[PDB]
Design an enzyme around this catalytic site. Structure first.
Site, PDB file in Angstrom:
ATOM      1  N   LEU A  56       0.863  -1.207   0.000  1.00 43.21           N
ATOM      2  CA  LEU A  56       0.000   0.000   0.000  1.00 43.21           C
ATOM      3  C   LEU A  56       0.893   1.249   0.000  1.00 43.21           C
ATOM      4  O   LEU A  56       0.457   2.297  -0.516  1.00 43.21           O
ATOM      5  CB  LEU A  56      -0.912  -0.053   1.229  1.00 43.21           C
ATOM      6  CG  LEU A  56      -1.952  -1.177   1.219  1.00 43.21           C
ATOM      7  CD1 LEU A  56      -2.854  -1.109   2.439  1.00 43.21           C
ATOM      8  CD2 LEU A  56      -2.783  -1.142  -0.052  1.00 43.21           C
ATOM      9  N   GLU A  58       6.616  -0.708   6.452  1.00 42.17           N
ATOM     10  CA  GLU A  58       5.976  -1.088   5.171  1.00 42.17           C
ATOM     11  C   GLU A  58       4.562  -1.589   5.487  1.00 42.17           C
ATOM     12  O   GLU A  58       4.418  -2.396   6.416  1.00 42.17           O
ATOM     13  CB  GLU A  58       6.791  -2.181   4.486  1.00 42.17           C
ATOM     14  CG  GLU A  58       8.288  -2.003   4.632  1.00 42.17           C
ATOM     15  CD  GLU A  58       9.041  -3.321   4.644  1.00 42.17           C
ATOM     16  OE1 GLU A  58       9.801  -3.557   3.688  1.00 42.17           O
ATOM     17  OE2 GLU A  58       8.850  -4.117   5.603  1.00 42.17           O
ATOM     18  N   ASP A 100       1.842  12.981  15.850  1.00 50.22           N
ATOM     19  CA  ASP A 100       2.144  12.929  14.394  1.00 50.22           C
ATOM     20  C   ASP A 100       0.855  13.135  13.621  1.00 50.22           C
ATOM     21  O   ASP A 100       0.613  12.432  12.613  1.00 50.22           O
ATOM     22  CB  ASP A 100       2.866  11.634  14.037  1.00 50.22           C
ATOM     23  CG  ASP A 100       3.609  11.664  12.710  1.00 50.22           C
ATOM     24  OD1 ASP A 100       3.916  12.798  12.210  1.00 50.22           O
ATOM     25  OD2 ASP A 100       3.853  10.547  12.177  1.00 50.22           O
TER      26      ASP A 100
END
Ligand SMILES: Brc1ccc2nn[nH]c2c1
Ligand SMILES: Brc1ccc2nn[nH]c2c1
Ligand SMILES: [Cl-]
Ligand SMILES: [Cl-]
Ligand SMILES: [Cl-]
Ligand code: NA
Length: 333
Positions: free
Chosen positions: A44, A51, A155
């Site tokens: 994706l 990953e 974040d």
């Protein structure tokens, strides 16, 4: 003397009143699952520490998302797992389904319930006024929830908001930088992506809290209503504060530095200069004016403050007039 101490205005002591086990993630014992329950379908994307793949659970033929935890300290792994388990079932927070290890490589992976690989950054420069308000309110539900559970995300940015626009559904993802809030704790300021870093990170004020997420949210809102990506476009972490100072002004910046007795890196001394606080009208033009309202600017102004204590909390933000029509329509549905 050192920097003046700071406490969160809300949810200050929620971890102190929990059992040690809630927040002491170093002591958490993970039952590691079997990687062979899943088959990877396709990549994706590949991030910094991760990953991410579409996968199948071959037991139930259910679609899942798998995040392979790229080489990192075990401490960071346990932290992300514990935060995901603590927040599981919360509004608009991604659901951890399993935790597994490769029998060979011994590499940990997280399995999540499926979401489409459509992040907010792909959509958030094309929304109506109503949809900006709608999706901002959905993000605020996730943030008030995680803050109420003693956790700051650290974040918040469009790439970490997954949207299913067809179903009007949103999930806050990538809890890899999230931390538990403890009053008096000094945190790492090397978190968040440059354009979303709060002034506390840029001036190295370590005793920050949930309010860091509310700055990041303000940066997202400014980007969307002004169609300016990113809103604060610094070359590096030093120039990032200069870009902020040219909008918020230097008077409030130096008052903030004085209030917390912050020792400003010497590099800042020649680059910050002297700037007025700009009226938001300066950023309005013919291609964004349909997204900008007095309500939007009043709300944005209350998120983008140097002083982290001054910023709206997530729950105060949800009570702002900007969301009145969203709140009324939710009650009707
Ligand atoms: Br979950 C999972 C399933 C299959 C995998 N093959 N390599 N890495 C994997 C992780
Ligand atoms: Br679902 C999903 C997708 C990507 C992610 N990155 N961190 N956490 C994630 C969860
Ligand atoms: Cl982003
Ligand atoms: Cl800029
Ligand atoms: Cl002005
Ligand atoms: Na307008």
């Amino acid at each position: 003397s050192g920097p003046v101490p700071s406490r969160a205005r809300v949810y200050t002591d929620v971890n102190t009143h929990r059992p040690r086990e809630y927040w002491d993630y170093e002591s958490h014992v993970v039952e590691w699952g079997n990687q062979d329950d899943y088959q990877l379908v396709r990549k994706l994307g590949r991030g910094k520490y991760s990953e991410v793949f579409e996968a199948i659970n071959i037991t139930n033929n259910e679609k899942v998302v798998v995040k392979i935890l790229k080489p990192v300290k075990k401490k960071k792994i346990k932290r992300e797992i514990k935060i995901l388990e603590n927040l599981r079932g919360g509004p608009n927070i991604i659901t951890l389904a399993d935790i597994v290890k490769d029998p060979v490589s011994r590499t940990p992976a997280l399995v999540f319930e499926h979401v489409n690989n459509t992040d907010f950054k792909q959509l958030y420069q094309t929304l109506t006024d109503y949809d900006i308000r709608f999706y901002m309110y959905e993000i605020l539900k996730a943030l008030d929830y995680c803050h109420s559970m003693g956790i700051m995300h650290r974040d918040v940015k469009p790439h970490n908001v997954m949207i299913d626009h067809e179903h009007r559904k949103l999930r806050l993802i990538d809890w890899g930088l999230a931390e538990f809030y403890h009053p008096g704790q000094e945190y790492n300021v090397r978190v968040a992506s440059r354009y979303f870093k709060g002034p506390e990170l840029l001036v190295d004020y370590q005793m920050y809290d949930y309010s860091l997420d509310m700055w990041s949210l303000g940066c997202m809102l400014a980007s969307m209503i002004f169609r300016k990506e990113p809103f604060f476009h610094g070359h590096d972490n030093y120039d990032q504060l200069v870009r902020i100072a040219k909008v918020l002004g230097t008077e409030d910046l130096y008052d903030y530095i004085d209030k917390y007795n912050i020792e400003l890196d010497p590099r800042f001394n020649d680059i910050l200069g002297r700037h007025s606080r700009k009226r938001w009208e300066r950023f309005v033009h013919s291609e964004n004016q349909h997204l900008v309202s007095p309500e939007a600017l009043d709300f944005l102004d209350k998120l983008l403050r140097y002083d982290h204590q001054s910023r709206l909390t997530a729950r105060e933000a949800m009570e702002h007039p900007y969301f009145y029509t969203v709140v009324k329509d939710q009650a009707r549905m």
